[PDB]
Amino acid sequence: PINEELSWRINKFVNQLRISYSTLEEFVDNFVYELKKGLEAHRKHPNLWIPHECSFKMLDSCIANIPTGQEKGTYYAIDFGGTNFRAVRASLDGKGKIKRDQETYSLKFTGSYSHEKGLLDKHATASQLFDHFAERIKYIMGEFNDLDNKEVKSVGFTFSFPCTSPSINCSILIDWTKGFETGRATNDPVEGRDVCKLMNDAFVRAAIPAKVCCVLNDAVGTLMSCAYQKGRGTPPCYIGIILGTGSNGCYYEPEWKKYKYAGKIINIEFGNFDKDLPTSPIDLVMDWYSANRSRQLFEKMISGAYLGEIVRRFMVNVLQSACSKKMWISDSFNSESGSVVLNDTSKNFEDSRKVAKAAWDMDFTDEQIYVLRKICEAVYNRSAALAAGTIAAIAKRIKIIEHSKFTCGVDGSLFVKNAWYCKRLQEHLKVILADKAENLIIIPADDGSGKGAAITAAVIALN
Ligand SMILES: OC[C@H]1O[C@H](O)[C@H](O)[C@@H](O)[C@@H]1O
């Protein structure tokens, strides 16, 4: 039970974050419309993204051979998913089974102090990033005695960024997202260059006996892994969703041949959606402070690289002068801390006080811990609601041609590391799909980004 001047603030600011069922429907409609415009735009100029024609990049994956579940072998993969970089080793057993061995390192915290924060810096060169990839592949390879010999090892590469892929072995970086600016201020950029080559050169510098044989977006990797692990009689995987540091999805487009595609699976790049976004003033501020102003706008509303900060800025606006100096500090509250508050089962809300004291140095009153709950609910629900609409809209585009039972695989910290979020996304998704809700099967695909690169390396072997 709370002061009235506070509650008026609570009611006002949560209302900027509400999403009614009618508007969410318009979203699904606007999304589906934007999808066809992307397909038609791709038919006209398949090699070029003309953004005024469509916010979606609708990029060809060059994948036409879906996994059969029988792909066999052991392959290395490198999973470049964003702020963290993860190197993997995976063996395939010939049935839908995967053993996986993984080592997650960080790009922000390289161990240097130049370049402000990270290998993301405009002043970091391209060569450093790809060398660091080879450096960690070297270490994982030496550990397994696979490295020392002189016969070349093939490697799958998931590059979680919008790329133009003229082939499965060719991928040109279009635009950095998720806060990266690597090479933009140097003579050695990543943007506009073949990432397959840049990596193969990183192998060459370190004498590593490896070669990248495929480059794929992390969303498509999730789909590939699901298809491989697809049980007999279990419907096929036609959608891959990543809901994590960034937010994006791939899907199976039946008209792939018609609209001049080489693969069947399209990387939508829906993070860059810009039509009728239900923005709040904090959303304008977040975009303004970004390194990619006016791009990835939808992602800046719903992605996990951004939820904690949205909560914080809303938090400051509601409690007003009761906030500690650290409450005003940018990026004091990450999205993981929001997961704790939403998924708190302690009695005295003990766990929720800890994240508040840990981030802000405030022994939260019972009043203020109530506020942190509601502000976390209002923000996170907006992400889940729009995310469900996104899935449904993708489902509607497929079902327009192909209506049946099929499954959609979901990956990323926001979905597998947050029970509350996973509940809301599925709840909203059940509402939008209406009667057909039973037709879409949501299945978690943990580490689909990393497995899928390896499975793709296998399918190349199979031809
Ligand atoms: O990390 C998941 C998503 O985040 C960003 O939007 C990337 O541009 C996109 O390629 C990726 O699929």
Author numbering: 24 to 486
Per the authors:
PfHK is the first and simultaneously rate-limiting enzyme of glycolysis, catalyzing the phosphorylation of glucose to glucose-6-phosphate (G6P). ATP provides the phosphoryl group and the reaction requires divalent cations, usually Mg2+. The overall fold of each monomer is similar to that of other hexokinases and consists of two domains: a small domain comprising residues E94-L239 and a large domain comprising residues M1-Q93 and N240-P490, with the active site located between both domains. As already discussed by Srivastava and colleagues, the tetrameric assembly of Plasmodium hexokinases is unique since most hexokinases occur in a biologically relevant manner as monomers or (pseudo-)dimers.
In this study, we present the first PfHK structure in a closed-state conformation complexed with glucose. The crystals belonged to space group P3121 and contained two monomers within the asymmetric unit. The active site of both monomers contained a glucose molecule and, in one monomer, a citrate molecule was additionally bound. In subunit B, the P-insert occupied the ATP-binding site via interactions with the large domain, thus inhibiting ATP binding and causing the C-loop and P-insert to adopt a pre- or post-catalytic conformation. The P-insert is rearranged in our structure upon citrate binding and probably also upon ATP binding. This movement is responsible for the loss of multiple contacts between the small and large domains in monomer A. Of particular importance appears to be the interaction between the P-insert residues L130-S135 (small domain) and region P304-Y312 (large domain), which, in turn, is part of the AB interface. The loss of this contact alters the AB interface and affects the neighboring molecule in the tetramer. This could be an allosteric effect, possibly explaining the binding of citrate (or physiologically ATP) only to one subunit.
